[PDB]
C-alpha cells in the first residue's frame with residue numbers, strides 16, 4: 001500500500017493514459033483545464049474510485065458525455081483532499097473508461113513556482129515551473145498520485161504567444177490558440193508509461209541551443225551560451241549510460257537550466273532533465289549532476305520504486321551508475337574518491353539525525369510523514385554503500401554491472417519493492433548465494449545508523465585533502481604563518497571541496513585560523529557553488545561576522561535547498577546573525593518556492 005496516496009490503489013484500478021488540455025494564466029497564477037484519465041478497472045463490479053488532489057478547484061467530472069457525482073473529502077494535511085467519483089455504470093475487470101475532470105489549480109500550488117518578470121533573467125516576461133516529485137502532481141491535476149501506477153500522456157498547453165511551453169515529453173508542434181490569438185498552443189507526447197511524479201511543465205521566455213545529436217539545452221537567452229559549454233559532456237555520458245544500462249528508450253535527452261529558485265540540483269523529468277543554474281561553475285566540474293539525472297533514464301524512470309518507502313532503489317542505484325559514468329570518464333581513482341566522499345556525507349546525515357533515528361534506515365515507513373520533511377542523503381549514500389559493498393563482495397565492478405543491466409531489463413516499465421530487488425539479486429547470483437547469505441540483510445535494509453560494513457576505498461585522491469585538513473585542525477597560532485597559496489597548487493576543485501568538507505566536519509575552528517585561510521587561499525573569490533557553500537558554512541560556524549552578508553546573499557540569491565537550508569540554519573544558530581536570518585527569511589518568504597519556504601520555516605521555527 002502507498003501510504004502517501006489517498007487514491008484507489010493499483011489493485012483496484014489503474015490509470016493508463018492522461019490527456020491534459022490546459023491554459024496557463026499568469027494574471028491569476030492558475031492552470032485551468034481538463035485532465036482526461038483513461039482508467040482500467042482491476043476489479044469486478046467497480047462503481048467508484050478515488051483520486052488524489054491538493055488545493056484544486058473541481059468544476060465538473062464528465063463520463064460518457066454526462067456530468068457525474070463526485071465528492072471532495074476533508075483535507076489530510078500535506079496529502080491533500082481525496083476525490084471520490086461515482087461511476088455511472090459498474091465496470092467489469094479490465095474494462096477501460098475515460099473520465100474528464102474540469103479543474104483549476106490554486107496560486108499556492110505546492111507543485112508550482114510562479115515568477116514575476118523581476119525574478120527572471122530577461123526582466124520582461126514571467127515564468128512558471130513545476131516540481132512534482134514526490135507527491136505534488138496532485139497539486140496540479142487529479143491523479144492516482146503514486147509511483148505504483150504508470151501511464152502515458154499527451155498534452156496541449158495554451159500560453160501567452162511570446163512564451164514557450166516545454167514538458168517531460170516529445171515536442172509535438174505549436175499553433176496559434178483558436179480561442180485567443182494572443183496565445184499559442186504547444187503539444188506534447190509521452191509514449192513511454194511513466195509514474196505521474198515525472199510529469200513536468202515549464203513556461204517562460206526560453207531559447208535553445210543544440211549540444212549533441214539528441215540534446216538541446218534550454219534556458220533564458222542570457223544563460224544559453226554558458227549552459228551549452230557547462231554541459232557539453234552530456235552526449236558522452238549518454239553513450240556510457242547506454243553501454244551500462246541498455247537502450248535509451250526516451251528519444252530526446254534535453255536539458256533545462258531553471259532560474260535560481262529551482263529547489264534541487266537536478267530532476268530526471270523524462271526527455272527534459274531540469275537543473276539548477278548553480279551548476280554553472282564555468283569548468284564543467286559539477287557535471288556529475290548530469291551523469292546522475294541521465295542515469296535515472298534507467299534506474300527510476302524505467303525501473304521505478306513502488307512506494308516512497310523504497311526510494312533508495314531509485315536513488316542508490318542511480319548514484320551507483322552516476323559514479324561509474326564518472327569513473328569511465330575520469331578514471332577508477334576518481335570513482336573511489338567520490339564514493340568515499342559519499343560515505344562522508346552519510347556520516348554527516350547519521351550524525352545530524354542521530355544514530356538510532358528511523359530515517360537513517362534504508363527502508364523507511366513514511367506513514368503520516370511528509371516526504372519533503374523526511375528527504376535526506378540517507379537513501380542515496382546508504383543505498384550506494386550497500387551496492388558498493390555488494391560489488392566488492394560478488395567479484396567486482398564488471399560482474400556487478402552485469403547484474404545492474406539484467407536488473408534494468410527485468411524490471412523495465414514496472415514499479416517494484418526492496419524484496420523484488422533482493423529476490424532478483426539472489427536469482428541473478430544464484431551461484432553465489434552462500435556469499436549473499438553472509439550479508440546482514442536486516443541491518444543494511446531495516447536498522448538505523450551507519451551500515452554494518454564499510455566498503456574498501458582507494459585513497460589516492462583523498463590523501464592530500466585529509467593531510468591539509470589535519471594540518472589546519474592541529475595548527476596553533478604559531479603554525480598559521482606556514483600556510484600559503486601554494487598549498488592548493490596540486491588540488492583539483494573536487495579536492496578543494498573535499499578539503500573543506502573534511503574541515504567542516506570538525507567545525508568550529510578558531511576564528512584566527514579561518515581569517516588566515518581567507519588570507520592565504522582567498523576562498524571568498526571562488527564562485528563554484530559547492531566550494532562556496534562549504535566555505536561559508538565553515539565561516540559562519542566558526543563565528544566570523546564578515547561572512548554573514550556573504551552567507552545571507554548566497555542563501556537568498558539562489559534557492560537550491562541543499563545550500564539555502566543549511567545556510568539559513570547556520571545563520572540562525574549564530575547569535576550575531578540570528579535576528580537577520582529570520583528577518584531575511586520573513587522578507588523573502590512570499591516570493592520563495594512553496595516547498596523551500598515551508599522547510600526553511602520549520603528549520604528556523606518561524607511562522
Ligand SMILES: CC(C)C[C@H](NC(=O)[C@@H](O)[C@H](N)Cc1ccccc1)C(=O)O
Nearest residue numbers: 133134264265266267268288289292293
Ligand atoms: C547528483 C544527485 C545526488 C543530485 C540530486 N538530485 C537528485 O537526486 C534528483 O535525481 C532527484 N529527483 C531530486 C529529488 C528527489 C526527491 C524529490 C524531489 C526531487 C540533487 O542534489 O538535486
Ligand SMILES: Oc1ccc(CCc2cc(O)cc(O)c2)cc1
Nearest residue numbers: 134311359361362371375378379
Ligand atoms: O521525495 C521523497 C521521497 C522519499 C523520501 C523518503 C526518503 C528517505 C529514505 C530513507 O531510507 C531514509 C531517509 O532519511 C529518507 C523523501 C522524499
Ligand SMILES: [Yb+3]
Nearest residue numbers: 171172173189
Ligand atoms: Yb506529430
Ligand SMILES: [Yb+3]
Nearest residue numbers: 423424426427
Ligand atoms: Yb528467491
Ligand SMILES: [Yb+3]
Nearest residue numbers: 476477478479
Ligand atoms: Yb607551536
Ligand SMILES: [Zn+2]
Nearest residue numbers: 292296315318
Ligand atoms: Zn536522483
